[PDB]
Every structure is written in structure tokens, then in C-alpha cells.
């Protein structure tokens, strides 16, 4: 499938379109889209919550829901905390490719 890039307008198809397809899921909140209320992630609700070991398993369980809806060509493997600086947690979104 051939789509266009979000910035700079260039049509990119293979796997750069795959990565921006995921980051339109993860950063859109629910109900922000027009006439598509069941689109996006609850990750903005997980913004600025304390990083516990139940916060990690609630992000894995919510990325898997939101990518399971509107990204069928990605099989999610794991989400892991790899570093912590002040506020900035960072997550290695790893997943196999299907489709």
C-alpha cells in the first residue's frame, strides 16, 4: 500500500508508511478524529502517570488494542521500558510484521 508522508508530502510506500501508520494510532487520542470516534489510543490518558509495573502492563494491553483495530499488518511482540530520565520514559515498541 502506497500512502503519503505526514510532513513534506512525499509518497512513501513500503515500511516508512508502516511506521507512520503506527504513530498515527499511538498519538491520536480517542474521539479526536472527525466521524471516527473509535480511533486512536488511550496513551494520552497514560501521559503523566507514575511508571509502576502495572503501568507497563496497561500500556502493553492498550497498544495491543489500538493497533489491533486499525493496524492488522503488525503483530505486536512487546513494549519495554528501556530508560528513565526526568519524566521522559521511553518504550521500545517491538513487533513482528504480517500481511
Amino acid at each position: 500500500m502506497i500512502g503519503m508522508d505526514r510532513r513534506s508530502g512525499l509518497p512513501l510506500s513500503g515500511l516508512a508508511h508502516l511506521k507512520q501508520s503506527v504513530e498515527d494510532i499511538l498519538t491520536t487520542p480517542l474521539g479526536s478524529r472527525r466521524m471516527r470516534p473509535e480511533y486512536g489510543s488511550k496513551l494520552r490518558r497514560m501521559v503523566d502517570m507514575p511508571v509502576s509495573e502495572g503501568w507497563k502492563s496497561a500500556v502493553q494491553a492498550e497498544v495491543a488494542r489500538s493497533l489491533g483495530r486499525w493496524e492488522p499488518r503488525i503483530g505486536l511482540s512487546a513494549v519495554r521500558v528501556v530508560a528513565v530520565v526526568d519524566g521522559r520514559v521511553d518504550l521500545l515498541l517491538s513487533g513482528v510484521f504480517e500481511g
Partner: protein, 285 residues
Amino acid sequence: AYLEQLQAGLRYLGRAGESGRKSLDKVVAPVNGAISEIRGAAAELENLPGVSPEMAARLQRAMRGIGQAQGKVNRVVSTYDRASRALLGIDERLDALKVQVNSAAQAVGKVAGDISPTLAGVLPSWLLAPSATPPSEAAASLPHLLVLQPLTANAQPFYFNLNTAAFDALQRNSAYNWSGQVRLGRRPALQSVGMGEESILLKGAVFPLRRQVGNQEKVVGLEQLEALRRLAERREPLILSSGYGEVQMGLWCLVRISENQSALLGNGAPRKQTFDLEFKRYGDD
């Protein structure tokens, strides 16, 4: 002369719709005594400058009553045969009540208009709006064992951990639909005619007096298995979200809940709830 006219006009229709129970002939004379007599006020009220803040609420008290008088006549008349009504000939007469009283109601509304339909049931944009913030279960200090979450995508998910349900068994039946066709002189041929039912069965036990982890001044509740019931009467598939192998399990509709709550307290409160959930994989595209 509307102060004499309409109040006498409702008096005829009180005889019209009530002296017509088991007869027909007693209806026509008060109806003839009203149509040519409500016209005596529908022509009188053609030219009034809005005479009083009173004296026209009286017209509203009357025209509500004459509006009730059409409903009494036209229902008592409608209980009869049409052929018995056609020989009397008031099918072409009760429509003149729809002409004269409507011309009288338009005449009252020109002199004294109606009150505006005021609004007291105006709510804010909250009482039908879900709290999209995640609950205290998702922020707990326990890794979630399994997660139920529906298709509406804004409803509150159910989190399996030691605070809520915490199953320790997981049956996963998965058939494969191979149909046998018996051939006479040889082995029966097997054909793959589908996929068959794949099911997941969650055993376990909820002890609703063990306090939540770290002694959070809060116990495991009695509500905390009925939340599985409320999430199951949505008639809606559920995404299972584990955390070990594949994380994106499919759509799994919930089929059966059966708790065995025993060791009761005085008010019927158990302190063990051994349940077994039972799912079937919703076959989406």
C-alpha cells in the same frame, strides 16, 4: 359576545360526546347546536386588540376544553359501524368541527398567543460522557495477568491481577473442523470444512476480604466479580491482552460466568468466590 358564546359552546359538546353511548340520533342536535354556535365566536374574535391579560386566558381555558370535546365526540362516534354512521350522516358534519374550532383556536391565538415552551431539562455535556481517565487498577503496582476490553473503545476495561480476580488455570480448547465422509471400500475421506470453536476457560477464586496489595486501606470487593457480569451483558466481543507470547489475541466474546460463593458472612457476604469464565473466539474478518 364571546364571554357568552364559547362557554355555552362547550356545554353543547358535553351533551354530544356523552349522549351517544348506545345511540346515534342524540348526537346530531348538540353538534348542530355547536358548529353554527362556535362560529358565533370565531366571527366575533376576528377583531380584538388583545383586550386584557385576563379575559383571554379564559379563552385558553375554554379552547383547551373544546379541544378535549373533540376527543370525546370523535372516540364515541368511532365505536360505531360506518354504515350506521353513513345513514345518520355525521361523517360530513364532524369535519365542520375541525373547521370551526380550528378557526376559533386560530382566532384565540391571534388575540392571545401561547406561552413559550420553557426548558427545564437542559443538562450539561457530562451526564452522557464517559470518564476517559484510566481507573486505579491500571495504575496499581501489580503486572496485569489478562485484560478484557470491548469494541466501543471508550468503556472501562477489566484488568486481571491479584487485586481483582487473579486466575490460576487456563484451559484453551481449539478444535479444527475436519468432516468425515465414509467411502464404502476404503478409509473415510476427511475435508477441512472450517475452523471450529476455539474456547478459553479461566478458573480461579476471588477472596473479597484480602486487602489490596501494600495495605491500601481498601479490600478486594464484592463488586469485583459483578464487574465481569456488567461487562458481559454488553453483547459485545472483547480483546484479550496477555503479556507473554502473542499480545494481540483476537476478539473473544464472553459466554459463561459461574461463581461458587461460600463461607458467608451475616448479611450474605461471601469470603470466597470460585468462578470459571468461558470465552469463544469471535470470528472477525
